[PDB]
Ligand SMILES: OC[C@H]1O[C@H](Oc2c[nH]c3ccc(Br)c(Cl)c23)[C@@H](O)[C@@H](O)[C@@H]1O
Ligand SMILES: OC[C@H]1O[C@H](Oc2c[nH]c3ccc(Br)c(Cl)c23)[C@@H](O)[C@@H](O)[C@@H]1O
Ligand SMILES: OC[C@H]1O[C@H](Oc2c[nH]c3ccc(Br)c(Cl)c23)[C@@H](O)[C@@H](O)[C@@H]1O
């Protein structure tokens with residue numbers, strides 16, 4: 056199975072697999088059962104912004120999600136990612152729906168990775184930004200139902216004509232491998248931002264959006280729909 | 292008195308004011324008596340590199356100092372800087388000598404600050420880099436004995452002709468105020484790197500180099516030589 | 528007198544001092560009488576975006592101004608700025624009104640400068656961004672009528688209560704000097720972006736907004752209102 | 764055949780295919796017969812640094828190559844690349860040897876691309892840096908004889924044990940496609956830097972190093988050794 060480090064924006068409480076009894080932001084380490092969560096309140100149809108950062112000295116993955124004029128929700132978790140992830144990863148977003156549904160629209164996405172080795176190189180770095188998406192994005196690996204629409208949004212899950220579809224899954228990974236640790240490595244860091252638009256006609260949205268880091272050859276696991284956010288093959 | 296948040300590379304153990312019994316990297320919050328330290332071994336006359344990062348969600352100031360081919364020393368400390376620092380600060384380096392002495396040469400320095408407010412601006416940012424210093428650096432506030440030499444090094448303490456001088460103090464602050472928190476602020480971060488060259492003809496070097504963040508109008512306090520690193524007026 | 532290199536977004540044709548018979552973007556070298564212009568059509572009350580870039584090998588200052596869904600206006604001019612500007616400059620925006628008037632609102636501003644010397648340093652660099660302005664921006668030198676309003680816009684000229692005022696002048700310079708050439712310099716570059724909002728209740732707006740680079744101690748010259756854009760003391 | 768825009772650092776004069784009678788930096792547009800060149804003097808065994816920049820408003824590709832303490836060689840050429848290149852490209856370095864030989868060692872490489880569309884997005888961007896190369900660089904497409912050595916240099920052509928080999932060709936492309944123009948595009952830019960080490964035991968080195976931009980699926984053309992720099996299938 057894949058190796059997954061993820062930040063989930065979780066729109067639908069699944070109490071049987073560890074979700075708290077409310078919508079929440081979470082830190083996922085090799086499991087859908089978040090290691091930490093914070094209460095977060097979806098604002099139907101508004102543009103949200105998520106920020107994720109980490110560095111290998113501090114060893115603390117943090118995430119914060121906000122809406123305009125509104126107070127934010129943040130979460131943190133002490134973790135040494137370099138003992139978890141492989142040296143080379145891909146990064147991405149995913150989203151899913153189940154019996155309940157929502158738009159999982161990404162409006163923009165940026166990422167930065169830095170590796171600083173002893174000698175004293177500013178040793179290797181990657182920064183990408185998208186503030187909209189090309190109708191045919193050649194630098195994105197599109198998985199499952201993910202596509203870009205003609206407003207240049209990235210629609211991670213199916214929408215037929217304003218209307219989000221149930222039991223949909225989709226993921227976009229940046230085309231280049233990222234080098235996240237090395238043998239002669241002194242400090243590695245990353246920071247990602249994405250803005251997103253979650254809308255539902257139902258009183259209850261599902262299932263969420265996640266930012267995630269995985270083995271380079273990660274693909275959507277079998278059985279990963281709805282609650283498992285296209286990240287995991289099961290709920291362990 | 293000034294408000295000081297600093298990372299010290301401390302070359303000389305002052306056991307009467309809290310230094311551990313070895314050279315050490317430290318985190319200083321409003322006091323010379325570090326809140327956290329880690330053993331570090333000065334390599335006389337080699338080029339060292341220090342990295343410092345922080346963000347306001349994770350709330351963990353970390354620092355790591357390394358030399359080429361060598362293992363590093365890191366330190367961390369959980370702190371909410373936004374409850375400590377003012378909204379606007381300056382950033383800088385300082386150094387001092389006392390009865391013992393060393394070159395406090397900076398070879399390069401970069402800094403990044405980011406403030407992200409709710410609305411969803413990438414709201415305000417500053418990045419500067421120097422990989423050498425102009426003989427007359429108009430974007431640096433030079434304090435005390437700080438000057439740039441004709442190899443374009445920043446000599447924070449006095450050197451007359453290869454030879455570091457005792458009881459010297461010096462500081463360089465970047466000319467622009469940095470905006471580190473706001474009312475509508477969601478996350479603030481910074482990262483600094485500097486490379487430095489500490490040399491002594493004595494068996495024992497003193498006193499150290501620090502990176503620091505202070506009120507914009509911070510200046511060298513009276514009585515801040517030697518052990519107090521040009522950061523503090525006393526040892527409380 | 529000051530040394531001025533500027534890109535003007537010129538809203539009002541002054542045919543007696545060289546303006547073409549239409550609103551226009553221009554390149555100004557030590558004179559209000561642009562060295563090059565291109566036709567540009569103000570869209571009353573829309574948000575515009577201007578981009579300016581230069582590097583010292585290519586020796587070609589270019590500028591382009593656009594509005595959403597609309598085609599842009601670009602201009603270029605072959606110039607060696609390093610033989611014109613001093614080694615250290617400040618950068619800024621200015622704006623003016625005269626008998627005719629407009630809002631000269633800046634919504635955001637970013638700038639980048641890079642100097643690469645032979646040895647092979649990435650030798651010195653500055654990047655700043657603002658996507659809104661602090662009610663009390665300590666890293667901006669505010670001149671004349673320039674102020675930030677409570678939406679965090681930078682109002683370069685006077686507006687009393689929705690309404691732009693006639694015979695107003697204002698400028699904002701970034702607080703730090705920029706190092707634009709050196710003796711051992713191989714290539715120097717800069718790029719600036721700003722977004723702006725020009726509105727008038729009159730059929731005819733005046734006078735314009737400019738991005739500009741000047742001696743560090745540049746201030747608004749006497750007699751520089753209206754057509755001279757707060758850049759020049761006269762029209763030579 | 765491939766579509767090639769390249770900057771060549773050309774170590775060996777081939778007078779029968781248009782080379783001037785000296786080592787030279789050149790701008791190549793769809794042909795090995797440079798559109799512009801400047802005299803450049805290889806310094807055997809020193810570390811050189813090359814800078815390349817372009818933007819689509821100015822429409823002027825420029826390049827400059829320097830060695831430490833030394834004066835540089837620059838070249839420029841007025842070209843609209845967006846009418847030449849496809850919307851999506853890859854970028855890379857290549858090098859070759861023939862009957863004469865040299866090390867074609869890259870010590871570091873960085874690239875930046877920016878696309879700014881009307882609406883007013885900072886619309887899409889890529890920045891990568893390498894200051895050394897991983898023994899197994901998963902984010903580089905290695906072609907022909909290109910490999911990384913155990914000092915973490917990128918050896919574009921064969922070296923067996925200090926000694927550069929004759930009739931060798933090699934190329935490294937960054938793994939991700941770059942988006943260089945769009946339909947709603949206002950301005951596109953890029954800047955690349957690389958540092959390199961060319962050494963020969965012969966009195967006469969050959970053949971050179973190039974930075975290049977090509978269709979995403981570009982590979983080494985048949986018959987492109989020696990003088991054609993691994994860029995072209997012939998000399999037209
Ligand atoms: O989209 C929300 C949820 O929908 C499904 O679970 C159900 C939520 N309400 C139900 C009602 C009936 C049945 Br059968 C099911 Cl599986 C469900 C499943 O797809 C869950 O994974 C998902 O989290
Ligand atoms: O530079 C090292 C140290 O030198 C001075 O302290 C002394 C170290 N050895 C001594 C021996 C005698 C006397 Br008096 C003094 Cl003050 C000292 C003081 O300046 C200290 O602040 C400094 O840390
Ligand atoms: O704001 C537009 C213009 O207004 C003034 O010029 C006039 C434009 N129409 C006029 C009508 C009468 C008189 Br008096 C004047 Cl000075 C003007 C002057 O302030 C000009 O500098 C400015 O460009």
Ligand SMILES: OC[C@H]1O[C@H](Oc2c[nH]c3ccc(Br)c(Cl)c23)[C@@H](O)[C@@H](O)[C@@H]1O
Nearest residue numbers: 775860861862863864969970988989990
């Ligand atoms: O490496 C330098 C040059 O070597 C070859 O050309 C020759 C240079 N001197 C020669 C002498 C004899 C013969 Br046969 C040849 Cl092909 C050559 C060819 O490989 C050229 O493409 C290359 O530019």
Ligand SMILES: [Ca+2]
Nearest residue numbers: 065067068069
């Ligand atoms: Ca859930």
Ligand SMILES: [Ca+2]
Nearest residue numbers: 301303304305
């Ligand atoms: Ca001490």
Ligand SMILES: [Ca+2]
Nearest residue numbers: 537539540541
């Ligand atoms: Ca005018």
Ligand SMILES: [Ca+2]
Nearest residue numbers: 773775776777
């Ligand atoms: Ca040749």
Ligand SMILES: [Mn+2]
Nearest residue numbers: 065074081089
């Ligand atoms: Mn959950």
Ligand SMILES: [Mn+2]
Nearest residue numbers: 301310317325
């Ligand atoms: Mn100490």
Ligand SMILES: [Mn+2]
Nearest residue numbers: 537546553561
């Ligand atoms: Mn004009």
Ligand SMILES: [Mn+2]
Nearest residue numbers: 773782789797
């Ligand atoms: Mn040639």
